[PDB]
């Protein structure tokens, strides 16, 4: 499967001036566009080489739409402050994510659109793209209103139509990277914590996409105790990194095997000290 996903954050700045607004587009785990109210252009900007191939008409359009998104968030911060009956003194946040997934076939699989105020679910579009999930009674008002305005219809048209038509366009144009898996470069490290015990660490580096599984085995059986697993982390060059460690008795390092599953590996790897 593949996905195109837009992320939007607005943060009210009560002391002076309008809210901070940041938008990022992604194809799978590749950021490809950006907008930031504080930056100089006041334009949607490219962040992947494969999107620079689009002409000015595309950039004017995306810039128009992203500004319109910005205003809608500014406006919504007002609505929400009243609804939740908060003062004009506090800073508040609105977050929005929407996007479509295509499946193995490159045909529409899934659409989504979720909205949060101060880091809490407010409203979200349901699976069927026809109805809404209101988290509380403020959102209920929105749900009833948006249902009466057929907001869903316009959104469904986009998510199952345009969204997937452009995701395919991006995938073809950026096939050299977006359709290439970088398999993990893997290795192990030994960290003598005392005379009696040691820490084995299993490393996955320079892989893409972000999805990866690292698991430990003792004598061919899954072990979880005395392990640690860090959150997957960006390398900074478009790839990701992750590791998993296990504390082991000294001299017993060979019982333990690290197992690595990833899309760009034909068969799962195994490593051993």
């Amino acid at each position: 499967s593949h996905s195109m996903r837009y992320f939007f954050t607005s943060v009210s700045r009560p002391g002076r001036g309008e809210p901070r607004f940041i938008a990022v587009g992604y194809v799978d785990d590749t950021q490809f566009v950006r907008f930031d109210s504080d930056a100089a252009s006041q334009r949607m900007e490219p962040r992947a080489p494969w999107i620079e191939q689009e002409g000015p008409e595309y950039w004017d359009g995306e810039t128009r739409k992203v500004k319109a998104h910005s205003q809608t968030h500014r406006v919504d911060l007002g609505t929400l402050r009243g609804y939740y009956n908060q003062s004009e003194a506090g800073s508040h946040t609105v977050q929005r994510m929407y996007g479509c997934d295509v499946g193995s076939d490159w045909r529409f699989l899934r659409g989504y659109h979720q909205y949060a105020y101060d880091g809490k679910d407010y409203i979200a579009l349901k699976e069927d793209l026809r109805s809404w999930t209101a988290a509380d009674m403020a959102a209920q008002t929105t749900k009833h209103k948006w249902e009466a305005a057929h907001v869903a219809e316009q959104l469904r048209a986009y998510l199952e139509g345009t969204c997937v038509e452009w995701l395919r366009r991006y995938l073809e144009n950026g096939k050299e990277t977006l359709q290439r898996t970088d398999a993990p470069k893997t290795h192990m490290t030994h960290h003598a914590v005392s005379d009696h015990e040691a820490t084995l660490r299993c490393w996955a580096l320079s892989f893409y996409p972000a999805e990866i599984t690292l698991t430990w085995q003792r004598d061919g059986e899954d072990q979880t105790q005395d392990t640690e697993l860090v959150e997957t982390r960006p390398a900074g060059d478009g790839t990701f990194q992750k590791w998993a460690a296990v504390v082991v008795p000294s001299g017993q390092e060979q019982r333990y095997t690290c197992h690595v599953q990833h899309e760009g590996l034909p068969k799962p790897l195994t490593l051993r000290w």
Binding site: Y6, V66, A68, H69, T72, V75, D76, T79, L80, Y158
Partner: peptide, 11 residues
């Protein structure tokens, strides 16, 4: 390619 419309909570 962004959604061409972004309807507010209140119009």
């Amino acid at each position: 390619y962004l959604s061409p419309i972004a309807s507010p909570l209140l119009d």
